Amino acid sequence: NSFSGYLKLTDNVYIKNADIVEEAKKVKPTVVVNAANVYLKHGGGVAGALNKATNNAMQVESDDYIATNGPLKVGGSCVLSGHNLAKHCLHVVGPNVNKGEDIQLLKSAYENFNQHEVLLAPLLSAGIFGADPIHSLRVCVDTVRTNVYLAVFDKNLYDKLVSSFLE
C-alpha cells in the first residue's frame, strides 16, 4: 500500500491525478476497486483498462462468477482476484444515470468500500456513467469510513474536484 503523491482531503480520503491502472502496478494495493456493471462485462473505460492490464484473466474469472452466482444489483459488489494488480478486486456497481438508474444508489455503491480497510478506487459513476463528479466526491467523503485513495485520470477534473472540496 505504498501510495505516493496523493493530496489528503479528510482523515480517510486521499486523491491523485493518475491512471488507476498505473497506480495499481506501482502500489500493489490490498484492494483495487473496479467501476463494474451488473454482468461484469469489462468492455471499455476503467473496467476495460483494468481487464486489459490482467491480459483478460479478469474477464474470464468474472464470466465464471456470473455463471454460478448471477448478476450483481446496482449499488452492490463482489470480491474477486486482484490478479497482478492487487490482492483483491472489489467490483462495485454504481448507478449509470445516462441509462436511467437512480443517483441515490451511489451511497449504497460507496458503502461497499467500508468492508475493506484500504482501497485504491476510481470516482464512482463519473465519466460515461453520467453522475456529476463533484457530487460523487461528496458522497464518497460522506459515506466511506475506511481509507480510500482515489485515482482520477484527468488533471482538469482533478483540479475542479480539489477546488470544490476546499470551498
Ligand X SMILES: CNC(=O)Cn1cc(-c2cc3c(N[C@H](c4ccc5c(c4)S(=O)(=O)CCC5)C(C)C)ncnc3[nH]2)cn1
- Spatial contact of 133 and 142, defined as CB atoms under 8 Å apart: no
Residue type, 65: Y
Any contact of residue 14 with ligand X (CB under 6 A)? no
Q: In the complex, what is the shortest distance from the CB of residue 91 to ligand X, in angstroms, rounded to a whole number? A: 12
Number of CB atoms found within 10 A of residue 86's CB: 23
Task: Please choose, out of 58-66, 78-86, 103-111, 148-156, the segment that lies near ligand X by the rule CB under 6 A.
Answer: 148-156
Q: Which residues contact 51 (CB under 8 A, 6 or more apart)?
A: 42, 58, 59
- Spatial contact of 160 and 13, defined as CB atoms under 8 Å apart: no
By rule CB under 6 A, what string of x and - marks binding of each residue 49-78 to ligand X? Answer: x-----------------------------
Any contact of residue 32 with ligand X (CB under 6 A)? no
CB nearer ligand X, residue 36 or residue 67: 36
Q: In the complex, what is the shortest distance from the CB of residue 30 to ligand X, in angstroms, rounded to a whole number? A: 18
